[PDB]
Design a binder for this molecule. Sequence first.
Ligand SMILES: [Ca+2]
Ligand SMILES: [Ca+2]
Ligand SMILES: [Ca+2]
Ligand SMILES: [Ca+2]
Ligand SMILES: [Cl-]
Ligand SMILES: [Cl-]
Ligand SMILES: [Cl-]
Ligand SMILES: [Cl-]
Ligand SMILES: [Cl-]
Ligand SMILES: [Zn+2]
Ligand SMILES: [Zn+2]
Ligand SMILES: [Zn+2]
Ligand SMILES: [Zn+2]
Ligand SMILES: [Zn+2]
Ligand SMILES: [Zn+2]
Ligand SMILES: [Zn+2]
Ligand SMILES: [Zn+2]
Lengths: 426, 426, 426, 426
Amino acid sequence: TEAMKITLSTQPADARWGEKATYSINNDGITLHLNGADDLGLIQRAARKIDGLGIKHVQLSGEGWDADRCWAFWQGYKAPKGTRKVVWPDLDDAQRQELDNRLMIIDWVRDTINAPAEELGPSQLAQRAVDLISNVAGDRVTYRITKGEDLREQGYMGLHTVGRGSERSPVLLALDYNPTGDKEAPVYACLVGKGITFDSGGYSIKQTAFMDSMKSDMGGAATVTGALAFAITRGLNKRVKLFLCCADNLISGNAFKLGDIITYRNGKKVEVMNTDAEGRLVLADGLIDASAQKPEMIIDAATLTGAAKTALGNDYHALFSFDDALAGRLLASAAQENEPFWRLPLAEFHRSQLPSNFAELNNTGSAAYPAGASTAAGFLSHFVENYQQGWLHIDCSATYRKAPVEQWSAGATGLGVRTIANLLTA
Amino acid sequence: TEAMKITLSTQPADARWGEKATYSINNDGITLHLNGADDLGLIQRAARKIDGLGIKHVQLSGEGWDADRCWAFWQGYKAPKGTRKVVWPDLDDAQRQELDNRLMIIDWVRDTINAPAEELGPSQLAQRAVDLISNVAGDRVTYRITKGEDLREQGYMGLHTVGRGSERSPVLLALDYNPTGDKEAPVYACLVGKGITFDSGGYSIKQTAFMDSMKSDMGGAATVTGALAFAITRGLNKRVKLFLCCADNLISGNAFKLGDIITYRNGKKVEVMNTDAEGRLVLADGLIDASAQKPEMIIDAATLTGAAKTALGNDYHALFSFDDALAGRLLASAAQENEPFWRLPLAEFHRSQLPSNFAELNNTGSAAYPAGASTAAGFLSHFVENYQQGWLHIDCSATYRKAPVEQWSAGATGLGVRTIANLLTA
Amino acid sequence: TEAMKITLSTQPADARWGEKATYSINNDGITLHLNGADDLGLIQRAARKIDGLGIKHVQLSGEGWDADRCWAFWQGYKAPKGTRKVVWPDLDDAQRQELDNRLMIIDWVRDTINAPAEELGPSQLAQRAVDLISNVAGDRVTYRITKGEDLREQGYMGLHTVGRGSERSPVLLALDYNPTGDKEAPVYACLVGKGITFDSGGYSIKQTAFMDSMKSDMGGAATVTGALAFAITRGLNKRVKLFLCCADNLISGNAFKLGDIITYRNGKKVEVMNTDAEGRLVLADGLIDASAQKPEMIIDAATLTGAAKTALGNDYHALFSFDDALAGRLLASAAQENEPFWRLPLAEFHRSQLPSNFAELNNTGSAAYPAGASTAAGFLSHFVENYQQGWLHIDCSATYRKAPVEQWSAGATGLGVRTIANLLTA
Amino acid sequence: TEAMKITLSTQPADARWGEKATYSINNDGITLHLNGADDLGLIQRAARKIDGLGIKHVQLSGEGWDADRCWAFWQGYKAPKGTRKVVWPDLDDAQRQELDNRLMIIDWVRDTINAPAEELGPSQLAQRAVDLISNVAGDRVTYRITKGEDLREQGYMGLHTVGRGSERSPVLLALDYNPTGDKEAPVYACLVGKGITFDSGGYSIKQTAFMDSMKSDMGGAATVTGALAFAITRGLNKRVKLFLCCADNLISGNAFKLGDIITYRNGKKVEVMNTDAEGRLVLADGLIDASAQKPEMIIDAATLTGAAKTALGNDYHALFSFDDALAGRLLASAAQENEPFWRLPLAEFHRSQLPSNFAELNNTGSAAYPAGASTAAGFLSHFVENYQQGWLHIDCSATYRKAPVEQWSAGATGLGVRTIANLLTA
Ligand SMILES: [Ca+2]
Ligand SMILES: [Ca+2]
Ligand SMILES: [Ca+2]
Ligand SMILES: [Ca+2]
Ligand SMILES: [Cl-]
Ligand SMILES: [Cl-]
Ligand SMILES: [Cl-]
Ligand SMILES: [Cl-]
Ligand SMILES: [Cl-]
Ligand SMILES: [Zn+2]
Ligand SMILES: [Zn+2]
Ligand SMILES: [Zn+2]
Ligand SMILES: [Zn+2]
Ligand SMILES: [Zn+2]
Ligand SMILES: [Zn+2]
Ligand SMILES: [Zn+2]
Ligand SMILES: [Zn+2]
């Protein structure tokens, strides 16, 4: 499959293509027509079109290619079907290294989220996460996998109650990246991820059109895993712990039921009035562990609500926090890493918008309080001891594209890895 | 939490509150303004409002308080969340006795129905029922529990078929209150209760808005259990048998299916065309055992249909019977015990309104015969040997309040306990 | 065309048909095998079967035929398609007169309700009612037809608001049957009928499956009109007034809207929160006019709720009243006239189960009070001056069969005419 | 009635109510317990609870009462049913003036949005707006009303196409508040408001649960009208134009249809693929007129999308703009006026998220671009000549409460009036 030359030009396309065409093709190959408005976005969109032409082998030739332009092209060219090869252009040592780290880790996030639930159950997610971080951390990473009946015995009633309906046991991954080597080193940041490997909705069963992409309901877990790995390649030299709450949310003779009250280790009692709001139930157990470590920073990521996508579409990740200064610091990281985040409201009154007639907390909202992403964020705040300080919640509205768009193939995008990594090492 | 005084007055409140105000608050405490139209109702409603003010500790002070006015206040004050404390007023030995028996047994019915399915499965239901009766009956009670595969070996195909989908096995509690201890003693009455600890609807899955309260689908079993216990405290000195058909109605690779034909021990064949019409399938097995005891009367109770709630709301329990004299006696008991019952139609033609193209009986009605509670009553009559006499069926439309109302908190009300107890001891 | 003879026998069919067959056929014709259990019911079901055989011309032959048995047969034989001929047997004068009165008036009720909306608009319904009563009342009847803008101008805001959406003007028929001709004669009774000639639901549009029979939403109006004409054939010699509130509930640029507030002539303010609950809005105007006549009793009939059919199927009409003695007299009339009625609950608390946040009354109920037929009856009570005495509300759940059944063809049954006529002449 | 005294106190209530209790009662009256956290929020909630006690006559007694605490109490005490009398405390001339202007203008917005559609059609909304402004401005305001067919002849195809299905003609109100009188005086700001007096959804009909509050679909028009009047009381000394696009969105034989293409005076062609997205179609016409006045600032307000409520609940208004500095000024005005606003995303790409196969623009988004409030903002940006600068779009998600909550009765809140007025006068 002979290669197709991809060249960069600041000159416009000829009249046959128009002064508005972003790409044109002659015998020598394909020319991307840059204009300076948003060249990375234009390149990623031209790459999506090129995949559409059936061009499975390209060569980025000529001058003008840097790491971001190469990455922008690949981000758009890569698709879940067929094999693609990109002959990279000669690059600076530092840029080639940055690019290989993006291809190694951000593509692991896209591929892991795209993996079918049958291939990636809770145990595989936990192990693949250890394998990714072990490949870049070496002996600086240690971990503990707690699963099935052991979670119940230990009181992780959120993760266990949600995952016990499946024939594949729920799993808690607790990973520790300790560079200094000092076993008593202060924990700088705690990362918590929602790892629902398949979300049927449980007894609150989803419709097929809404459940057919639920193999991606572990997107949050994959995003914080990549963020820790990428942060290490960026020179992270501070202690960070990773908590993955992994489980399938299925229907069986043992699955949790509406009305069930989950008692957590911090004393919180939650009435389940919708089994499809299971992500917040498993994250609650991770936030309890992250909060006990009293780190300077707690970052959780989760494909938690459709509400976040009604508010930002798939175009931005939802940022929530009572801590304005830490939110400003994360949006600054996003600006530097070319990733999209938009802050949505989280105030004290959101902690009272999940009323229950039988327990202190309900896991689902009501008609009077329909801001689904904000009430879920208020729910999570009840599982972070100093919730007003140093805690960020990311609702992963930009993680998955059910259908191809202008700049993305179908599937996971990998967005969010770089922003969190930038914040961990800034 | 210091006690707030509650006083009764035949004088109206001042103009500030309103001439029609049922309660007012001065320096000395709260004053309930009685007019004599329906004092018990007014106090229960005032109690609900008082709970709304956040008052958690009250003392019933001054003259006028009796057992019924004390109970009316507690019936409206009690709610499933928080701790409340009532300092009773000096009462007569007989009245304090009656009140103590209502607090111990009727609140057992409210709390047991309110308990989540995870806390109260089929075995826990049967065991709590034995404990309540053993506490008031002593050595005059005996019982036999038949569960799981034993139900199928012994031909209890209705109870086994509905419950086998759950990892929590179906259970038949056969309890015998025999005061004389004589084994040949005549059985005065047989109580049969639907004990579906959780109803998902089965393959005919319910929507979340209709499933979120299904931990209460065993309200029938609790009501007859409380009725027997309360009757013993009222002097019951005749032999009474209790049959609790306990099961979870869940979805699994073992759950019953549409088109399945259940053959009962009395020869009736039933085609299942709706798995959510499971309560009548398990009750059928208890009615077969009730009939074989040749009792003077059979009383069954079940949170059986949405139709009864459409016909009577939550304001009355539905009463079905072919026996006019026995229904009259239950309505007289209802009047004396201040409980709401309303008779709905049950005639010979209802026994033919459940047509099936593959079996003698269908478990669900059709468009031509949409009287769901009457057709369910017709279905149950095929399992009572002498169905035209001594048999009462109660569709517990007043057992559970999904939301707080003027006189009740959310959850089980405990209604029906006193009426059945009065009929058993009259 | 040739007549198939129909004879009666208290002896059973031969073993080829079975000893349980209700009819058999020999060389002489068809024989109905009576057993004494319910001859009128068996005869009506047999006549439905004979219609099924395609026999269009029958002769009621031999002895044993009387008015009731001839009527029972015809009630089951008559169907909306095809033409049938029944050669009656020799009856005494009273018997034939009674039969001819049922054929003339009860089948008028069946045919009028069965008539399509295009043929029977508000104006046609009022005029046909006048034609029926003048035919038997001669010069003892006078009437007034008020329509369109005149209804709005004269304050009939309920009938006008519902009907103004149609290009066929709403119409009030006020008819006065005054035998003595004395304009000072006391009015003995007032009949109020819901005459919705077509109910689309309005902006609260109904689904096709529930709207395809809404040409029958004037069943109440036809039933009270027939009751008065039948009452006159029975010897009614007291003054009775008939009020028909006739209209189409359609969708247009002029139709009433959710949130609209209707102010009635008695001061009641009603917020419309469901345009499909339009029947009670028009009946309110008829009941104000009935109360103004200061009659000894008021009887309203209306195909008002689906709730009544969930409570009683199509097997009984729903009876609502605060007056136990009057309700008892109507159930006694119903037994004497072989018609099915069942009393559903109506208490003072139902008058407050239709809360509105913008007006005194809502026209639709809520989840906390789902007894639709009882809340609707409680709504109507706010329009009866002495609602606690002499007023009966009939929710016509037995008026229309959407599909043929054992004893009825598809369509209106005519049930209700005889009972009301009996109560008016008793 | 008799005034119930309401006193402020910085001392907690006794242990009978609790230390955390926000209000306590005695024979002297009701005492509100201020802790200093959110005195205004606490006073508003206490007032709501006082309305629940059924107190219709209150007196704010003692010191501490200023315009803001008086206003906070009134904001929670005011409800759409019954009459409330508040005996104000003595207040400084300036404090009392501010309070009287809030009562007059903000309650006007609450009462006008709460008015039923039957009472407030397009012409009544236009004339009531004129009455409010001309009442505070006098001869300093002139206006032009364009109605029905005149709108089609002058090219207002958005407003005319949406409102022509109604019997009540659409109406454009163009109001000019010109304080200097100079005809050439530059226009400082243009206000544009969605005046849909009733939204049935059109052929894309709404379900009753979502259409029962649609009398409030003109909330944006009432809010900008109230802001101008309030600005005038705050001393607005600059020229401001107000444009209200008023219409009913009904179903009739003349109503607009799916696939219809609307040509706007600015050349934009819009294909209607959802008649329920009609607010953006009428705003387009008001935004064209607003831009033609070349003002320094354009502010539009509309109850435009359910997406804004999924993003912010009813707790905040949605703010959309391409102008970061102007958006910053509205948020500062919001903080000074104690009103809740939250900024949602509006980027150049949103202008392409409403693809159509038959026109330049679609009036509705797709599954790929589900941020309905942002794509609606993108749509409106195509009708603002200088859309990147001096233009704010408010999606009024905090305008209407369908059910009563802690601090609000059911209905319009009146929120947004003060913020826009503050911005206009800053
Ligand atoms: Ca996956
Ligand atoms: Ca329970
Ligand atoms: Ca008709
Ligand atoms: Ca309005
Ligand atoms: Cl670069
Ligand atoms: Cl078990
Ligand atoms: Cl009244
Ligand atoms: Cl006032
Ligand atoms: Cl444009
Ligand atoms: Zn889920
Ligand atoms: Zn999930
Ligand atoms: Zn069921
Ligand atoms: Zn059930
Ligand atoms: Zn209707
Ligand atoms: Zn109707
Ligand atoms: Zn709309
Ligand atoms: Zn609208």
